[PDB]
Amino acid sequence: QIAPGQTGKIADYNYKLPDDFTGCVIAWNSNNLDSKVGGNYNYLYRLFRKSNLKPFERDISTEIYQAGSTPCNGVEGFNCYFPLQSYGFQPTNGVGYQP
Amino acid sequence: IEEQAKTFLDKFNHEAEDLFYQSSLASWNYNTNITEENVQNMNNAGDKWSAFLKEQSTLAQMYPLQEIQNLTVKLQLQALQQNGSSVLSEDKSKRLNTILNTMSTIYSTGKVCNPDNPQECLLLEPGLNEIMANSLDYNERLWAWESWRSEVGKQLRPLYEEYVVLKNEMARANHYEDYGDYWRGDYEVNGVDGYDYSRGQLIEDVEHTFEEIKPLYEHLHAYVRAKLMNAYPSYISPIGCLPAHLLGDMWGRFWTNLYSLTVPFGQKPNIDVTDAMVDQAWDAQRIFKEAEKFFVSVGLPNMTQGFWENSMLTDPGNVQKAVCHPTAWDLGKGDFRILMCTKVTMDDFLTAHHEMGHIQYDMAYAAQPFLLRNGANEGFHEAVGEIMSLSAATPKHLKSIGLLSPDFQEDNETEINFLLKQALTIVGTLPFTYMLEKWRWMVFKGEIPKDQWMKKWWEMKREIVGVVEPVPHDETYCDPASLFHVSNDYSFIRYYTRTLYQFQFQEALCQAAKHEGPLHKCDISNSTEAGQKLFNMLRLGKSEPWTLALENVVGAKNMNVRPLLNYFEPLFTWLKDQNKNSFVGWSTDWSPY
Ligand SMILES: *[C@@H]1O[C@H](CO)[C@@H](O[C@@H]2O[C@H](CO)[C@@H](O)[C@H](O)[C@H]2NC(C)=O)[C@H](O)[C@H]1NC(C)=O
Ligand SMILES: *[C@@H]1O[C@H](CO)[C@@H](O[C@@H]2O[C@H](CO)[C@@H](O)[C@H](O)[C@H]2NC(C)=O)[C@H](O)[C@H]1NC(C)=O
Ligand SMILES: *[C@@H]1O[C@H](CO)[C@@H](O[C@@H]2O[C@H](CO)[C@@H](O)[C@H](O)[C@H]2NC(C)=O)[C@H](O)[C@H]1NC(C)=O
Ligand SMILES: *[C@@H]1O[C@H](CO)[C@@H](O[C@@H]2O[C@H](CO)[C@@H](O)[C@H](O)[C@H]2NC(C)=O)[C@H](O)[C@H]1NC(C)=O
């Protein structure tokens, strides 16, 4: 999902690059430090957000989502969710679910 | 409105794939290193997973199912909004679980005592099944056979009579007319532009296909009877129904233990390569690497790497307490593994292909949403395993993998020993598998009342199977309930449907493989087209119906039994010659007493 031209849950709501991006992307497998058997829930991610990002919006803003027409003041019962989730990284994960 | 349900299910997937993971990991860790601390730790993980899934079911009910335009988000809501249990009064929910736990303990703990020696008593598996698998004493077998029913079956009868009420209240409260139709619900398909299928339509397609099997079965029955008359002289009529205590286990479910009594050409040794594996010094790693070479040879992906370290193929070097029962494990997070304790054998070389063929299915639909990561119906999931073992059992595979010599020759007499050994497993059970489901479908709807439960059963054993009570029975017995699948509440119709689909898949891949011979010689190797037609069905999971997945592989929108019969035409042609002077089929009026 991490490129110019690419789409997905990260590429809409977490990390956009301009479609003519002046630069490069580098990545390496980190099972051997980012993951432990208890579930390293340390890393979070924006699973829900209204509208869409622009490129390079590190929008730390954290309030409850709400879809369609409902008010929501916390509680997050139905049609409204807390916007972040943890990654469940563990050293026993398969390759595509590794950190 | 619909788009809220997409976001609600996105929450569910990212929550569930992790709860499911550490739950199923604790289950794995218990199974491979058994301690009461591990029992507690896996149980309260399974508990906290269950507690999440039922909360999410009452939150999924909030969504109108009829407003959903998308079919995929609709399957995910329908599978989560299901009520299943709960619909009962909670004291009737508690009573149902109390009865199920009571039928489960009575079946498993059930002792049969020797009347010659009342101080010696046998559980079901040790000693009591062993007489039915290996004794040739008609009276010792008849003693084990009727003692199981008269000592244990009579305790399950009075429980079954209350379980059938509680199951049907639950099915009705879920708006199905009976709990037999609740089970059928798996096969239901709607709204998919000509690919639809009714719960009831299974019963008609079973009964339409089964009578194409009856001609093959009636000659196999006559041949088995003509051989059993030499093992049991005077005890069997040449036109009789077969006495149930003679059929190789406690119920007659498979005829495969009769191979040594029924054999066509036993002086020709039916092939083995276990001797070749030990003389080539293979181990658990080689056994699975030559199995992996078969799936990459057909063009499928290899092991998910971490598989090799996180799987257990062997019983440990530490004297570890573990369940060595062979099982393909999926635990989510792409974490596929295989628990077994292999010993260097061709049976294990072929179980390695069978169980790896489960992992190879799971991996294809790993890209589907979590609620859709299962087989297209409950039958497909073993059938996609077995077609790999069918490939690997061939002498063409075994001579390409070095387990048979280049100068090894196949003679006709070896082929007929093989096909008869197969038919006693593949075909001999199909009357039992249709009939036990027919009896439960008739019991849950009340077409058989409780003053006919045992009366009807033995009329059906006699009419559908050609198999007869060694001793008279009455409504104080429950011979159906004397079985795991009936006492532990498990729907059996998945075995009939899976045994049909298996040969459709086989013959479709045989045509792709340009196969020049009979269907049983066929090897899934070096073939490319076969792998492409296979993978394009494997990667669909539940997202598309089984009725569409069939026309992807086979070209047909429903189940067809011709391919199974076309595995056996060389054998059926032989059985006909072996029956010319004999009587074929049976008299329902005959009884052994
Ligand atoms: C609802 O149906 C549409 C199509 O009928 C699905 O849309 C596709 O979604 C994937 C991403 O999941 C895209 O890559 C495709 O390009 C989309 N195609 C079309 C034609 O829309 C959509 O996924 C379905 N909803 C869900 C929840 O699966
Ligand atoms: C599930 O069981 C409930 C009864 O516990 C059925 O009735 C629902 O009752 C709840 C309140 O507890 C309402 O919110 C629902 O509207 C009722 N059902 C609906 C959605 O009409 C309910 O019908 C059952 N659901 C299924 C799967 O049929
Ligand atoms: C296996 O093949 C052999 C070779 O054809 C069969 O032997 C023939 O059997 C018929 C019927 O008895 C005879 O008319 C032929 O003369 C036999 N051939 C020879 C060369 O003697 C044998 O019957 C086959 N066995 C099975 C089980 O099909
Ligand atoms: C089926 O696949 C195997 C595996 O690639 C092929 O085996 C090769 O056979 C050639 C000549 O027979 C040998 O020189 C190679 O060393 C073999 N490869 C391996 C890895 O052992 C086999 O030829 C294929 N069958 C057909 C008909 O093409």
Instruction: Count CB-CB contacts under 10 A for residue B152.
Output: 21
Resolution of the experimental model, in Å, one decimal = 3.6
Residue B542 to residue B555: CA distance in whole angstroms: 19
Residue B172 to residue B154: CA distance in whole angstroms: 28
Residue B439 to residue B160: CA distance in whole angstroms: 13
Token representation of residue B336: 């596929």
Q: A72 burial class (0-12, 13-18, 19+ CB within 10 angstroms)? A: middle
Residue B252 to residue B215: CA distance in whole angstroms: 20
Strand ranges (DSSP E) for B524-582? Answer: none
Output phi, psi for B152, to 5 deg.
Answer: -100, -45
Residue B179 to residue B172: CA distance in whole angstroms: 8
Judged by CB atoms closer than 8 Å, whether chains meet at B306 and A95 is answered as yes
Please, are residues B570 and B415 in contact by the beta-carbon 8 Å criterion? yes
Say if ligand 4 is within 6 A of residue B528 CB.
no
* Cα distances (Å, whole numbers) of residue B123 to B42, B112, B414, B449: 28, 6, 38, 31
Residue B120's SS3 state is: coil
Residue B334 to residue B114: CA distance in whole angstroms: 51
Residues from chain B that touch A94, judged by Cβ atoms under 8 A, are 304-306, 333-336
Place of tokens 């290193």: B33
Q: B262 burial class (0-12, 13-18, 19+ CB within 10 angstroms)? A: buried
Residue B279 to residue B160: CA distance in whole angstroms: 53
* Cα Dmax for chain B: 74
Output phi, psi for B43, to 5 deg.
Answer: -65, -50
Nearest bound ligand to the CA of residue B85: 2
Closest CB from B8, B11, B334 relative to A93:
B334
Nearest to B556 by CA among B495, B523, B511: B511
Q: Which helix (H) or strand (E) holds A45?
A: strand A44-46
Residue B328 to residue A79: CA distance in whole angstroms: 37
Residue B372 to residue B517: CA distance in whole angstroms: 38
Q: B15 burial class (0-12, 13-18, 19+ CB within 10 angstroms)? A: middle
CA A61 to chain CA mean position, Å? 13
Q: Residue B137 carries which side chain, given as an amino acid letter? A: D
Token representation of residue A80: 């409204």
Query: Would you state the torsion angle of the CA atoms of residues B75, B80, B81, B82, taken in this order, to the nearest 10 degrees?
Result: 100
Residue B518 to residue B566: CA distance in whole angstroms: 8
Residue B213 to residue B143: CA distance in whole angstroms: 33
Listing DSSP states for B391-439 in one string gives: HHTSHHHHHHTTSS-TT----HHHHHHHHHHHHHHHTTTHHHHHHHHHH
Q: Choosing among B23, B80, B333, which should be mutated to test the A contact, i.e. which has the most A CBs within 10 A?
A: B333
Those residues whose C-beta lies under 8 Å from the C-beta of residue B29, and which sit 6 or more positions away, are B38, B41, B42
* Cα distances (Å, whole numbers) of residue B239 to B37, B222, B226, B231, B591: 59, 8, 9, 16, 11
Instruction: Count CB-CB contacts under 10 A for residue A73.
Output: 7
Q: Residue B203 carries which side chain, given as an amino acid letter? A: I
Q: CA-based angle B91:B94:B98, to the nearest 5?
A: 135
Residues from chain A that touch B304, judged by Cβ atoms under 8 A, are 94-95
Q: B490 burial class (0-12, 13-18, 19+ CB within 10 angstroms)? A: exposed
